[PDB]
Design a protein around this ligand. Structure first.
Ligand code: CLA
Ligand code: CLA
Ligand code: CLA
Ligand code: CLA
Ligand code: CLA
Ligand code: CLA
Ligand code: CLA
Ligand code: CLA
Ligand code: CLA
Ligand SMILES: CCCCCCCCCCCCCCCC(=O)OC[C@H](COP(=O)(O)OC[C@@H](O)CO)OC(=O)CCCCCCCCCCCCCCC
Ligand SMILES: [Cl-]
Lengths: 141, 73, 78, 81, 40, 751
């Protein structure tokens, strides 16, 4: 995780940015390398200017960072597939979030452990009466 | 049909079935003469101690005991 | 009790008021019009200050001169 | 807290759910149950909001990915404050 | 032509045509024989 | 290769494609051709509804801005054709199915009537006796008044107008066909906004009022002067007889003896015989002075023709709108209007939003101006005509405004480029939309508490037997001090701040009580605590509608909840039950809520107008001069509580609509019940959800499968967005039809 680098995008300010949560609870960071100084849509409203080289941006939510990432990788002449998304805690602790193992999740990758897997169809879930007075629902067993 | 000033063209269905039921309990207003509305009936020739009072109540139009009904009902 | 208008145009309404307003409008147009000479229809031999810089400029500033002059005449006419 | 995102064995490995997911809850992992040799996975359901884009995307006769909404957190409620 | 026929045969055109035919029938039948509350 | 004319370029900025789209009937037989998703084939009944929902969505149909512009141009032609057919039908019904000549002969003792019902199934009772042995439906459009003001006398003139309207409709239709299929103007042609604006200000508005001033001076004014003197319509010479005999014009207006010389020599004063500035109303008819209106249209022609010169086209002089826009930028707004000229020349939805907003505002202005300055003869005598036109123009304006919000949101979704909008007005408004919307929200709450809350306080105080603690002119007064001051300034204008004005612009501001026949045409309209409260109710409802719609536009791109909403489109149900539920986040859904709130606002506006005019304006004047108003001046003490509005306004004045059976107004009570029904019906769509209905369709489809009658186009419940569209459409229709019946019956029953 270590330290995060990058220049803040050229921007004059919005009311849609971070609130007290960013300092009190959690925040998110997205870094990306751009080939030139180009305008992009700020997920919190408005147009901002990304700089050639490295860019670090702080956003309020993980979904905002991921929307910016999709915009970077889908709306730019040389596509930007270089962005990394981190969760930043007020303790200074930084947590790397996206893309998990260096590879976008849309494509398969070795060394990934299946989670949420159910070895049956939907129609093979047990009857709730068979599990009542436990704490479980038919998908949790 | 009432708006255009011809209220005589209303489809007015007489609730014959509920009136007939009222007659079976003694309501003579409709003249169906069935069961308790017919003195000759075996249902009314029983000497039931309640029958005079029940008939007297149900055949006076002064209470809410089987209110008379019509097409509105 | 309406607004009285000079009664007949004769020598006062014309020239002394209308031509002067057209002249001063032509001056302010030659002073302040941006695209002075580039209309679809061009102007005949320039010489003086009428068709010296395009039929469009001349016509527009003459229209404005008649605006100024009508205003002046109706106003001073009380 | 978080919602629950289950992936069933009718998965055909088309990955459309992963592409639809706007919070990176899902991944593709190798499998041998389908021709695509891959199955969807939900290793980050703590970020899942429950917008159901994956289910909208799933092609299999009744979904092979199922989102059951559960305990609500500020991450799951999509809160930026 | 064939396109004009296929358009005049569409569902809204045909349903409005049949509704118009039936309305003409009912309106005229009530014109010549009004106020039929029941059969004599 | 259809009918090919020569050229007609005129060495101009014209640039057309000779024949891009060929004419054929085959795509008529393929419903759904304009959408790729529908050209395949209907598998579910949804395909059907979509076929109507995307018919005019030309953007989603093709990506060529030029083809969209040509489609819009030809559709404008077809729309003008439809409106021409409508107006020609109006004139035809006035010609061959109206008592216009009988009305013209005796307007006071007769009622305007067109449309004769056919005597069948008892509907012949709708042909009420309007006067002079004529039996029909009384019209509140006020067509007869516009026709008398125009100078109509015979039915054959109206018939000629109807024939001409049909011909003009055929002209517009052919023009649309020719300009989409044959000579189709290129995209570069539509983008000449300076040329278009110069022409519309000079040729459309200016020349229009110029020609109408000519007609009013030559036809309307002399015929109306002869009608107001009682010469009878059969004795007044035809309109052209005044052009053929200038002596007949000089005998009515001696100014016509001096000819055109006062015009060309600026001797305008002698034109005082027909170019006047009186101000008030005609004593004989209660309308505006037609000489005042002729002079008005003349000055409007002058102003608009002059204004048609500011913009630059081909000759260098004029203004570049892009220059004027780019010049305006201050220390608070970065680059100001840099980039607005580009979006207002490549986006149709931007122009559409602006134009809908301004046109709705203008129609509201038209209602509020035509009620208090009745421009047509005998209009103010007909309280039904007055109220009807007022409420109609109100509703039209409100709908156009809601559409303006809709297309602002559509522009934001579809035509917004952040690269073309950097640190300008649009960018900074998006960058502080949270501030904007939060403050508008606070203003809305403050207005709701301090308008409706006053009504609730008054209801509670009066119920408790505490009238001295109420808000009213007799207790805690809330006097509309500023409006009263402006009324007083208006009253003192003629002879003072308006020297050359003989009378006040509108007697609603004060002065004498102008009365024609037994009724009062117009009199001062006092303002008090009740008026204060109703006006602040109006402020509150307008601000809430604006809040909804502005929020819809400003967040159509994104929100803190849905950051990628722009990708979801203008119109979509939601983005899931997650994030707590995200129902109705789209711009479309904001339009959907704004529809209800505009309905609320305009219902209150028209109720206020009706009650105030019946209480403090309309009524009967006596030969002594005593004014007995329609509802006896009950506004000041009743309109301050909600129970007052429920009893003395609704319940009291609903007595005519409910007792309308067995009379000519029975259709009004029928439509009253009908509107109530449709309003109730809408609540099923608005209160429920698609899942239940689809599951019920499952069992119904099973019953069809049981007897082998299942259809190949599978029945599907209405989509979420469609459920709401049906709900709001039926809500608005039911409520508006209810109040339409209420207003028409009440106003026609009060004589
Ligand atoms: C939905 C229920 C309903 C029903 C029960 C009725 C019933 C009736 N209405 Mg009513 N009405 C309704 C709804 C209803 N209405 C609504 C919603 C409205 C508001 C628009 C009205 C408003 C209304 C008005 C204004 C009037 C009526 C009238 C009538 C009567 C006229 C009947 C008639 O002779 O017509 C026509 C009779 C026919 C037989 C037509 C059918 C002919 C077919 C096409 C030919 C088929 C024959 C076939 C070949 C024979 C084969 C035989 C076989 C054994 C081989 C009738 C009893 C009229 C009246 O005066 O009431 C007395 C009248 O004026 N109604
Ligand atoms: C024998 C006595 C008689 C008399 C005095 C009249 C008199 C009249 N009728 Mg009538 N009619 C009659 C018999 C009579 N009809 C019969 C026996 C029927 C049953 C078929 C009808 C059905 C009928 C209809 C449906 C209409 C008239 C109409 C008219 C009026 C216009 C006449 C016309 O041809 O214009 C134009 C005629 C028509 C538009 C329709 C002609 C009627 C034919 C027979 C039916 C064609 C309809 C078609 C099969 C399905 C409808 C589709 C639609 C697109 C046309 C006229 C005053 C019209 C009207 O009321 O004007 C508003 C009209 O629409 N009548
Ligand atoms: C014989 C006349 C004729 C023919 C056969 C065509 C043929 C065609 N036109 Mg065209 N057009 C015409 C007249 C005609 N048009 C006129 C009069 C106008 C001026 C309004 C236009 C303007 C025009 C535009 C802008 C467009 C077309 C398009 C098309 C193609 C799409 C098919 C279609 O329209 O779907 C079927 C249509 C119908 C069944 C029409 C039903 C009635 C509609 C829904 C409303 C009627 C309003 C009416 C036009 C207004 C005046 C009526 C009033 C007098 C009562 C098609 C091959 C479209 C295209 O390019 O396709 C991609 C397109 O965008 N036309
Ligand atoms: C501007 C729109 C408009 C409106 C809404 C009306 C409304 C009306 N007109 Mg009018 N009219 C108009 C324009 C209009 N008109 C124009 C432009 C003309 C000049 C051509 C006329 C000339 C006219 C005449 C001569 C008459 C009417 C009549 C009527 C009434 C009966 C309509 C009827 O039953 O026709 C009949 C409709 C049919 C037979 C069915 C139509 C066929 C359908 C569309 C086919 C669909 C299936 C495919 C009605 C209230 C009648 C009236 O006033 O009664 C006293 C009548 O006599 N109109
Ligand atoms: C003085 C010239 C002139 C005039 C009269 C008009 C008038 C009009 N334009 Mg146009 N326009 C012009 C120049 C002009 N334009 C130029 C130079 C351009 C290129 C930049 C455009 C491009 C433009 C576009 C893109 C559009 C219009 C549209 C319209 C119509 C919408 C307004 C309306 O509906 O009002 C009321 C309508 C009427 C009163 C109709 C009657 C007017 C008829 C059709 C023309 C007048 C007849 C002719 C001049 C001779 C009669 C007068 C003479 C006997 C004295 C309108 C009739 C819109 C449209 O297509 O509407 C259908 C539209 O989309 N204009
Ligand atoms: C599009 C608008 C329009 C139109 C078509 C006309 C058309 C006409 N006007 Mg008119 N006029 C207009 C606007 C218009 N004017 C305006 C705005 C004003 C107010 C300044 C006038 C005031 C006016 C006057 C005072 C006179 C005309 C006259 C005339 C007629 C000229 C006959 C003539 O001069 O012989 C010479 C006439 C005599 C020697 C007498 C002519 C048919 C003349 C006329 O007699 O009307 C019929 C006339 O003297 N007009
Ligand atoms: C706050 C600023 C402002 C305001 C208040 C308005 C308000 C208005 N404008 Mg305007 N506009 C603005 C900014 C503004 N606009 C700017 C900056 C530009 C330069 C790009 C334009 C250029 C523009 C044009 C060209 C026209 C208007 C017109 C109108 C009026 C339309 C009325 C109507 O819809 O009725 C009915 C509509 C009509 C009678 C005419 C309709 C004209 C067409 C259909 C709309 C314009 C087409 C558009 C330019 C196509 C190119 C865009 C893109 C595809 C390249 C309206 C009152 C129209 C008008 O008539 O002005 C008087 C019109 O012609 N505007
Ligand atoms: C000059 C005005 C104008 C223009 C040209 C447009 C243009 C457009 N609008 Mg818009 N809009 C307007 C006014 C306008 N609108 C108004 C006044 C409102 C407020 C209600 C809206 C709100 C609005 C919404 C919410 C939407 C649009 C949409 C659209 C696009 C699709 C057109 C369509 O609806 O398909 C075809 C039209 C219909 C299916 C209409 C038929 C249903 C009507 C409402 C029933 C009304 C019934 C009748 C009036 C009274 C009842 C009688 C009945 C019993 C017979 C189109 C480009 C849609 C879009 O997707 O934008 C891209 C859409 O989502 N508009
Ligand atoms: C009578 C029905 C009703 C009521 C009262 C409201 C209430 C409100 N709506 Mg709403 N709305 C309604 C119908 C109603 N709506 C319907 C049918 C729809 C569907 C279309 C909507 C959809 C809608 C939208 C989309 C929006 C609103 C908005 C608002 C708020 C506007 C701000 C305001 O007025 O300040 C406050 C006013 C009140 C709270 C009214 C009651 C005040 C009383 C008189 C005082 C009570 C005294 C005391 C508190 C009592 C306490 C009791 C004690 C035991 C504790 C407001 C609270 C807008 C908004 O949020 O604006 C900010 C907004 O965006 N509404
Ligand atoms: C009775 C009226 C009550 C209102 C008085 C108090 C005004 C409230 C806001 C103060 C600033 C706005 C006035 C200066 C107008 C003005 O433009 O100021 C100047 C400044 C921008 O001007 P620029 O120097 O940029 O001018 C260049 C332009 O070309 C920009 O394109 O505006 C702003 O600072 C942004 C804030 C405006 C948004 C504030 C509006 C808030 C809504 C309040 C509505 C009140 C209702 C009024 C009744 C009609
Ligand atoms: Cl009260």
């Amino acid at each position: 995780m270590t330290e995060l680098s990058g220049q803040p995008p050229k921007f004059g300010g919005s009311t849609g940015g971070l609130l007290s949560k960013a300092n009190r609870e959690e925040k998110y960071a997205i870094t990306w390398t751009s080939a030139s100084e180009q305008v992009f849509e700020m997920p919190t409203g408005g147009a901002a200017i990304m700089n050639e080289g490295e860019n670090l941006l702080y956003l309020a939510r993980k979904e905002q960072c991921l929307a910016l990432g999709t915009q970077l990788r889908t709306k730019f002449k040389p596509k930007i597939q270089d962005y990394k998304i981190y969760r930043v805690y007020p303790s200074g602790e930084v947590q790397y979030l996206h893309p998990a193992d260096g590879v976008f999740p849309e494509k398969v990758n070795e060394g990934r452990e299946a989670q949420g897997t159910k070895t049956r169809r939907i129609g093979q879930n047990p009857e709730p009466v068979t599990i009542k007075f436990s704490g479980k629902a038919p998908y949790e067993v | 049909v009432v708006a255009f000033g011809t209220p005589e063209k209303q489809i007015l269905i007489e609730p014959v079935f509920a009136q007939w039921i009222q007659a079976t309990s003694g309501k003579a207003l409709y003249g169906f003469d069935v069961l308790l509305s017919n003195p000759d009936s075996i249902a009314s020739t029983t000497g039931a101690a309640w029958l005079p009072g029940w008939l007297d109540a149900i055949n006076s139009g002064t209470n809410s005991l089987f209110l008379t009904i019509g097409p509105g009902d | 009790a309406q607004a009285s208008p000079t009664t007949a145009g004769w020598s006062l309404s014309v020239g002394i008021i209308m031509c002067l307003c057209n002249v001063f409008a032509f001056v302010i147009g030659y002073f302040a019009i941006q695209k002075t000479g580039k209309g679809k229809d061009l102007a005949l031999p320039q010489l003086a200050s009428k068709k010296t810089f395009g039929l469009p400029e001349l016509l527009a500033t003459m229209s404005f001169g008649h605006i100024l002059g009508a205003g002046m005449v109706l106003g001073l006419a009380s | 807290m978080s919602h629950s995102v289950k992936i069933y064995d009718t998965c055909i490995g088309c990955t459309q759910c992963v592409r639809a997911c706007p919070l990176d809850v899902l991944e593709m992992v190798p499998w041998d149950g389908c021709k695509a040799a891959q199955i969807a996975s939900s290793p980050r359901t703590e970020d899942c909001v429950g917008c159901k884009r994956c289910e909208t995307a799933c092609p299999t006769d009744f979904l092979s990915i199922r989102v059951y909404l559960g305990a609500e957190t500020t991450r799951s409620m999509g809160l930026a404050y | 032509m064939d396109g004009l026929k296929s358009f005049l045969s569409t569902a809204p055109v045909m349903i409005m045509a049949l509704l118009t035919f039936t309305a003409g029938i009912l309106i005229e039948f009530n014109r010549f024989y009004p106020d039929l509350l029941f059969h004599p | 290769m259809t009918i090919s004319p020569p050229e007609r370029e005129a060495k101009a900025k014209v640039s057309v494609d000779n024949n891009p789209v060929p004419t054929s009937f085959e795509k008529w037989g393929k419903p759904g051709h304009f959408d790729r998703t529908l050209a395949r084939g209907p598998k579910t009944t949804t395909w059907i509804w979509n076929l109507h929902a995307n018919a005019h969505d030309f953007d989603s149909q093709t990506s060529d801005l030029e083809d969209v512009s040509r489609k819009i141009f030809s559709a404008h032609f077809g729309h003008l054709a439809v409106v021409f057919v409508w107006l020609s039908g109006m004139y035809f019904h006035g010609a061959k199915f109206s008592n216009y000549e009988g009305w013209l002969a005796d307007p006071t003792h007769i009622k305007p009537s067109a449309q004769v019902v056919w005597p069948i199934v008892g509907q012949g009772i709708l042909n009420g006796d309007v006067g002079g042995g004529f039996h029909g439906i009384q019209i509140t459009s006020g067509l007869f008044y516009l026709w008398r003001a125009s100078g109509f006398t015979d039915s054959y003139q109206l018939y000629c107008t109807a024939i001409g309207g049909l011909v003009m409709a055929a002209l517009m239709l052919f023009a649309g066909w020719f300009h989409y299929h044959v000579k189709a103007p290129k995209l570069e042609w539509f983008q000449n906004v300076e040329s278009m604006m110069n022409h519309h200000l000079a040729g459309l508005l200016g020349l229009g009022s110029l020609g109408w001033a000519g007609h009013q001076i030559h036809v309307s004014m002399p015929i109306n002067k002869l009608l107001d003197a009682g010469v009878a319509p059969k004795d007044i010479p035809l309109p052209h007889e005044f052009i053929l005999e200038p002596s007949k014009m000089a005998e009515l207006y001696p100014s016509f003896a001096q000819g055109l010389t006062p015009f060309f020599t600026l001797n305008w004063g002698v034109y005082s015989d027909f170019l006047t500035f009186k101000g008030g109303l005609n004593p004989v008819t209660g309308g505006l002075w037609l000489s005042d209106t002729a002079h008005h249209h003349l000055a409007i022609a002058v102003l608009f023709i002059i204004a048609g010169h500011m913009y630059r086209t081909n000759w260098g002089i004029g203004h570049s709108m892009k220059e004027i826009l780019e010049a305006h930028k201050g220390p608070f707004t970065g680059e100001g209007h840099k980039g607005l000229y580009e979006i207002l020349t490549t986006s149709w939805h931007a122009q559409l939003a602006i134009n809908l907003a301004l046109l709705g505002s203008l129609t509201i202005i038209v209602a509020q101006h035509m009620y208090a300055m009745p421009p047509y003869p005998y209009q103010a005598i007909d309280y039904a005509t007055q109220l009807s036109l007022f409420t109609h123009h109100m509703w039209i304006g409100g709908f156009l405004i809601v559409g303006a919000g809709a297309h602002g949101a559509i522009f934001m979704v579809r035509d917004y480029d952040p690269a073309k909008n950097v640190n300008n007005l649009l960018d900074r408004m998006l960058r502080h939309r949270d501030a904007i919307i939060s403050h508008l929200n606070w203003v809305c709450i403050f207005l709701g508490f301090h308008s409706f809350g006053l009504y609730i306080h008054n209801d509670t105080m009066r119920a408790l037997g505490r009238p001295q603690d109420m808000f009213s002119d007799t207790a805690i007064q809330l006097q509309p001090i500023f409006a009263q001051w402006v009324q007083h300034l208006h009253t003192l204008a003629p002879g003072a701040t308006a020297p050359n004005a003989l009378a006040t612009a509108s007697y609603a501001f004060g002065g004498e009580t102008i009365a024609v026949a037994g009724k009062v045409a117009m009199m001062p309209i006092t303002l008090g605590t009740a008026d204060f409260m109703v006006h602040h109710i109006h402020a509150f409802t307008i601000h809430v509608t604006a809040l909804i719609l502005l929020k819809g536009v400003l967040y159509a791109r994104s929100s803190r909840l849905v950051p990628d909403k722009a990708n979801l489109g203008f119109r979509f149900p939601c983005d899931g039950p997650g994030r707590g539920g995200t129902c109705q986040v789209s711009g479309w859904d904001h339009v959907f809520l704004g529809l209800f709130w505009m309905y609320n606002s305009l219902s209150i506006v028209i109720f206020h107008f009706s009650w105030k005019m019946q209480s403090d304006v309309w009524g009967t004047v006596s030969p002594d001069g005593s004014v007995t108003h329609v509802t006896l001046g009950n506004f000041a003490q009743s309109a301050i509580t909600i129970n007052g509005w429920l009893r003395d306004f609704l319940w009291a004045q609903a007595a005519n609509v409910i007792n309308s059976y067995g009379s000519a107004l029975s259709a009004y009570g029928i439509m009253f019940l009908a509107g109530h029904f449709v309003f109730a019906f809408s609540l099923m769509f608005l209160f429920s959800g698609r899942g239940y209905w689809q599951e019920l369709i499952e069992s119904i489809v099973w019953a069809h499968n049981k007897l082998n009658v299942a259809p190949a186009i599978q029945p599907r419940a209405l989509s979420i967005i469609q459920g709401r569209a049906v709900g709001v459409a039926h809500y608005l229709l039911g409520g508006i039809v209810t109040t339409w019946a209420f207003f028409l019956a009440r106003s026609l029953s009060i004589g």
